Write a protein that binds this ligand. Sequence first.
Ligand code: FAD
Ligand code: FAD
Lengths: 113, 119
Amino acid sequence: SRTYRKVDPPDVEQLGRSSWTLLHSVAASYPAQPTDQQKGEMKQFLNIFSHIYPCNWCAKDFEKYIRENAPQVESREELGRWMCEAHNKVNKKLRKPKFDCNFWEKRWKDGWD
Amino acid sequence: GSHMPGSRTYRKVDPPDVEQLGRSSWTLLHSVAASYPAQPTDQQKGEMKQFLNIFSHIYPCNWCAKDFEKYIRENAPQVESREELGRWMCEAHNKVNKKLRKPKFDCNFWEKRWKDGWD
Ligand SMILES: Cc1cc2nc3c(=O)[nH]c(=O)nc-3n(C[C@H](O)[C@H](O)[C@H](O)COP(=O)(O)OP(=O)(O)OC[C@H]3O[C@@H](n4cnc5c(N)ncnc54)[C@H](O)[C@@H]3O)c2cc1C
Ligand SMILES: Cc1cc2nc3c(=O)[nH]c(=O)nc-3n(C[C@H](O)[C@H](O)[C@H](O)COP(=O)(O)OP(=O)(O)OC[C@H]3O[C@@H](n4cnc5c(N)ncnc54)[C@H](O)[C@@H]3O)c2cc1C
């Protein structure tokens, strides 16, 4: 109330945009040549994320997606592409335009100049 | 800042800075705490600890992550219930608030901010 303005909990939409920001940013700072431990932790991270993501149907669907499309974690390029395709699967459901994954790296890593 | 090549809705938005990444990631972390069970299973407890451990390794801000890793080491995540995990998350966020000279959030209002609203 006092120190901070009263703000309502995020809706599914706000949770989503916040969460893609984290997901794509995690991929953008993943190594080009990850260690075995980094590969395993990334797979584990995404598996648990799919269990705990705080939208029921979002999480359930994402778990099924991972089961059917194993995360590609051999390099940042692969993981970034995997994340882009995963995000595009959701865009397709929600009747959002397909994002061109050739721009994933500019959008989430390098910027536009 | 106009539309990216070949698109009609996606603008050339810059990668998030430390601030934008930060408020997005707090949104996810507190929201994770808010939908954690009152009575979690052993698997849920174990995965929550693993998730936060891995998060502390991979959080894309280097110094943010190293500090968070150290914070976890010194203040073990309290995962026996939603109430405990919310409070732990509020205290963790408050330690970063402290570092950054932002006000202390009164953790008694964590559930209203991240779960119940203010009606
Ligand atoms: C794992 C997950 C599952 C979800 N499932 C659902 C669901 O089932 N139903 C539902 O209603 N909501 C779901 N959400 C939320 C949904 O995807 C959106 O995040 C939310 O609706 C907000 O949409 P938005 O239009 O603001 O842009 P968002 O889709 O959140 O995207 C934000 C920005 O990401 C960039 N971007 C867009 N597409 C890509 C891409 N393919 N690759 C890289 N960058 C891209 C663009 O710059 C865009 O502006 C889910 C979210 C997550 C993280
Ligand atoms: C794990 C982690 C570590 C970070 N470490 C650093 C760092 O070392 N240095 C750095 O510059 N940035 C760091 N960041 C980012 C920083 O915490 C902020 O997110 C960023 O500066 C933007 O601040 P903000 O004013 O927009 O509000 P945020 O601090 O991002 O908070 C967003 C909202 O959360 C609510 N809130 C505030 N405090 C609490 C609380 N204690 N409990 C529950 N809800 C609360 C308020 O309503 C607030 O408006 C870190 C982020 C994370 C997620």
